[PDB]
Design an enzyme around this catalytic site. Sequence first.
Site, short mmCIF file in Angstrom:
data_model
loop_
_atom_site.label_atom_id
_atom_site.label_comp_id
_atom_site.label_asym_id
_atom_site.label_seq_id
_atom_site.Cartn_x
_atom_site.Cartn_y
_atom_site.Cartn_z
CG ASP A 1 -0.16 -0.12 2.60
OD1 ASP A 1 0.54 -1.21 2.33
OD2 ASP A 1 0.12 0.90 3.33
CB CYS B 1 -5.38 -1.62 -5.08
SG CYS B 1 -5.91 0.02 -5.36
CB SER B 2 -6.67 -1.44 -0.14
OG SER B 2 -7.29 -1.17 1.00
CB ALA B 3 -8.45 2.95 -1.45
N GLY B 4 -8.85 1.19 -4.16
CA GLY B 4 -9.10 1.29 -5.78
C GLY B 4 -8.50 2.42 -6.35
CB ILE B 5 -7.64 5.73 -5.49
CG1 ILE B 5 -6.98 5.84 -4.16
CG2 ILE B 5 -9.27 5.63 -5.54
CD1 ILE B 5 -7.64 7.10 -3.27
N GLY B 6 -4.82 4.21 -5.52
CA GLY B 6 -3.40 4.27 -5.80
C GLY B 6 -2.80 3.28 -6.90
NE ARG B 7 -2.16 -0.68 -3.23
CZ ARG B 7 -2.34 -1.57 -2.11
NH1 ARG B 7 -1.50 -2.64 -1.95
NH2 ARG B 7 -3.20 -1.33 -1.07
CB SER B 8 -6.64 0.79 -9.14
OG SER B 8 -6.86 -0.36 -8.27
CD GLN C 1 -4.03 8.46 -2.73
OE1 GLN C 1 -3.87 8.64 -1.36
NE2 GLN C 1 -4.80 9.12 -3.40
O1 LIG Z 1 -3.52 1.43 -3.68
P1 LIG Z 1 -4.69 1.99 -2.68
O2 LIG Z 1 -5.73 3.03 -3.55
O3 LIG Z 1 -5.38 0.89 -1.98
C1 LIG Z 1 -4.00 3.03 -1.33
F1 LIG Z 1 -3.28 2.31 -0.53
F2 LIG Z 1 -3.39 3.97 -1.85
C2 LIG Z 1 -5.21 3.59 -0.38
C3 LIG Z 1 -5.23 3.00 0.93
C4 LIG Z 1 -6.17 3.29 1.69
C5 LIG Z 1 -6.75 4.68 1.29
C6 LIG Z 1 -7.95 5.30 2.31
C7 LIG Z 1 -7.31 6.39 3.39
C8 LIG Z 1 -6.54 7.58 2.92
C9 LIG Z 1 -7.13 8.44 1.90
C10 LIG Z 1 -8.55 8.96 1.88
C11 LIG Z 1 -8.93 9.74 0.65
C12 LIG Z 1 -8.13 10.04 -0.50
C13 LIG Z 1 -8.74 10.93 -1.59
F3 LIG Z 1 -8.76 10.22 -2.71
F4 LIG Z 1 -9.73 11.13 -1.28
P2 LIG Z 1 -7.62 12.36 -1.85
O4 LIG Z 1 -8.51 13.16 -2.85
O5 LIG Z 1 -7.55 13.19 -0.30
O6 LIG Z 1 -6.17 12.04 -2.39
C14 LIG Z 1 -6.85 9.37 -0.37
C15 LIG Z 1 -6.20 8.65 0.68
C16 LIG Z 1 -6.70 5.43 4.38
C17 LIG Z 1 -5.10 6.10 4.88
C18 LIG Z 1 -4.40 5.14 5.88
C19 LIG Z 1 -4.98 4.05 6.43
C20 LIG Z 1 -6.57 3.77 6.17
C21 LIG Z 1 -7.28 4.44 5.29
N1 LIG Z 1 -8.66 6.83 3.99
N2 LIG Z 1 -10.13 6.69 3.75
N3 LIG Z 1 -10.77 7.33 4.39
C22 LIG Z 1 -10.26 7.87 5.72
C23 LIG Z 1 -10.44 8.60 6.90
C24 LIG Z 1 -9.53 8.78 7.81
C25 LIG Z 1 -7.96 8.45 7.67
C26 LIG Z 1 -7.69 7.92 6.51
C27 LIG Z 1 -8.75 7.51 5.42
C28 LIG Z 1 -6.47 5.16 0.23
C29 LIG Z 1 -5.85 4.71 -1.03
#
Ligand SMILES: O=P(O)(O)C(F)(F)c1ccc(CC(Cc2ccc(C(F)(F)P(=O)(O)O)cc2)(c2ccccc2)n2nnc3ccccc32)cc1
EC number: 3.1.3.48
Length: 289
Positions: free
Chosen positions: A185, A219-226, A266
């Site tokens: 991640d 992936c997990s959130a469907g945004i970083g590696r995807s 991400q």
């Molecule tokens: O490869 P992926 O896609 O699986 C990833 F690893 F990159 C990833 C994992 C977890 C998250 C959700 C997150 C952090 C987050 C929330 C919103 C965004 C966004 F797209 F909206 P932005 O426009 O801000 O860039 C981006 C990141 C998370 C981080 C660390 C641990 C767990 C969850 N997340 N989602 N909701 C959250 C509420 C509070 C804290 C973190 C949150 C986002 C991306």
Amino acid sequence: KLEFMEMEKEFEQIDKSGSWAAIYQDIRHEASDFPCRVAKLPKNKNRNRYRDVSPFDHSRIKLHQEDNDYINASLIKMEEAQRSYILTQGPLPNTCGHFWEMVWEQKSRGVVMLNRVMEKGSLKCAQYWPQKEEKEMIFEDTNLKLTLISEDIKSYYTVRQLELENLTTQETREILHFHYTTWPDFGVPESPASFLNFLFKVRESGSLSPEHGPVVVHCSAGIGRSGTFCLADTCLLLMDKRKDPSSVDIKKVLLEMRKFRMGLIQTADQLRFSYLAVIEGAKFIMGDS
Ligand SMILES: O=P(O)(O)C(F)(F)c1ccc(CC(Cc2ccc(C(F)(F)P(=O)(O)O)cc2)(c2ccccc2)n2nnc3ccccc32)cc1
């Protein structure tokens, strides 16, 4: 091919000046924003793995079902590259049926998973497919059955053949599952070669062809590696379709993609890796004479 030397010299320059972070922050702060009212409805709260990651209302995938048509998944259509992808989150324990329901309804032929199954942690994903050929799974809510047909485990990724059947019609389809297993991640793949090889395996399988529904990427959130996976594939297609490769602007393509789903790619390292894989990847496509 001075054109590639330039890009590489540019890439090297950015690496020297330590400005990948600045370039990335500039891109993300110009990202578009759209409503996600459906993802935010109280009844959909348990369908979202993450509070702040939601599909936009305009591009979300809808399940052709009765009760609730919601799934945290977005359709990314890249007009010029001639390619569509469905980007979704790693399935939740209660959304595995919705996930396969979506694969069916959208007639997708392939699934690209870029994360690892995690029982615990804040970055997880449910075991949504059979681990054993002899132990198939049935999704009661969506009346679907899935069976692992084959599995070829390699070093950086695993390719599986699955068989999905709509119990209502007894129809069945073959789904290819491509799981890249070494992509942490917020991290990058083992290497460009590794990533490119996986991507080429997915391409050659026909899973990305317009004949079928869009490939489902998660992936997990469907945004970083995807996001990283799709951007690289997309830019590659563009450098080959366009007269000159150097005309492809990673910033512009990423912004275009971000119109369909938020947060794609991400970290700055993911952006740099993305362009590094496109440079190397494009060199390959035009050199095996
Ligand atoms: O490869 P992926 O896609 O699986 C990833 F690893 F990159 C990833 C994992 C977890 C998250 C959700 C997150 C952090 C987050 C929330 C919103 C965004 C966004 F797209 F909206 P932005 O426009 O801000 O860039 C981006 C990141 C998370 C981080 C660390 C641990 C767990 C969850 N997340 N989602 N909701 C959250 C509420 C509070 C804290 C973190 C949150 C986002 C991306």
